[PDB]
Amino acid sequence: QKSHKNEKRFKCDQCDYACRQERHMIMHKRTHTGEKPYACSHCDKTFRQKQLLDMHFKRYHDPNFVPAAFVCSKCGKTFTRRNTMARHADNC
DNA sequence: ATTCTTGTTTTCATATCCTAAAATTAAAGGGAAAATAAACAATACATAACAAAACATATAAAAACCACCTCACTAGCGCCCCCTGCTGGCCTCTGTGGGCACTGCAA
Ligand SMILES: [Zn+2]
Ligand SMILES: [Zn+2]
Ligand SMILES: [Zn+2]
Known part of the structure; x- marks a missing residue:
């Protein structure tokens, strides 16, 4: 795991961008497969x-x-x- | 005158006594061979005395046997680290989780 420590640990299936943190993978995934389930309480x-x-x-x-x-x-x-x-x- | 009993001496007679010669017979005397007895001397047996050997008692002399003391061995239980390995927190250094500000791209 010292190979993976402080590196681009998580690759992305659709594109070759990589991020160290999983949370980044979930946010990165939503751009490719549009979910956008977060909504301003005053506008559309x-x-x-x-x-x-x-x-x-x-x-x-x-x-x-x-x-x-x-x-x-x-x-x-x-x-x-x-x-x-x-x-x-x-x-x- | 003649016949008949009775008493007393005489004398044979028949048993007995005495006497002496034979015979004889038992005593008795002597010669001699047995023969019992007796006086003396020798041998064997029994008794008494002396000396020594054997038996029994005392004593002590090594000596044997039994009991006690003592100097060890044999058990015994702690005692005391000591070392070694696991265990159960502890803490701090990496490392797991996340919020969010920031940027590059392309409208
Ligand atoms: Zn992707
Ligand atoms: Zn709004
Ligand atoms: Zn200025």
């Missing part, structure tokens, strides 16, 4: 993956969405994604 949307889209539910319906400012350096403009702040800060 049916989600494949777990509570990240339950976070969809939360935010799409909660007026307390509160987008984290995440202010940069001197210019100070706000962006919703970390990679954007790092790239624009490198030359700001």
Whole structure:
């Protein structure tokens, strides 16, 4: 098992992607064989993956969405994604 | 005158006594061979005395037998680690389970 320890332990039958964890195999499988049994309580949307889209539910319906400012350096403009702040800060 | 009894001496007679010669017979004397007895001497048997041998008692002299002591062996039970292996938690290092943020792709 030291061969399999901290490696791509679980192969996928349909495609050659591999993940270390089983949970990843169940989520990966649902994309190939569409089950999407997770459903926002306020809209029609049916989600494949777990509570990240339950976070969809939360935010799409909660007026307390509160987008984290995440202010940069001197210019100070706000962006919703970390990679954007790092790239624009490198030359700001 | 004649006849008849009775008493007393005489004398034969017949048994007895005495006497002496024979014969004889038993005593008695002597010669001699047995012969019992007796005096003395020798042998054998029995009794008594002396000396020695045999028997019985005491004593002690090795000596044998029995009982006690003692110096070991034989059992005995702890005693004390000691070593070795399993066992039952214990804990921490990998490793089993999972939530979730993150990204690359292609709309
Ligand atoms: Zn697959
Ligand atoms: Zn919703
Ligand atoms: Zn800036």
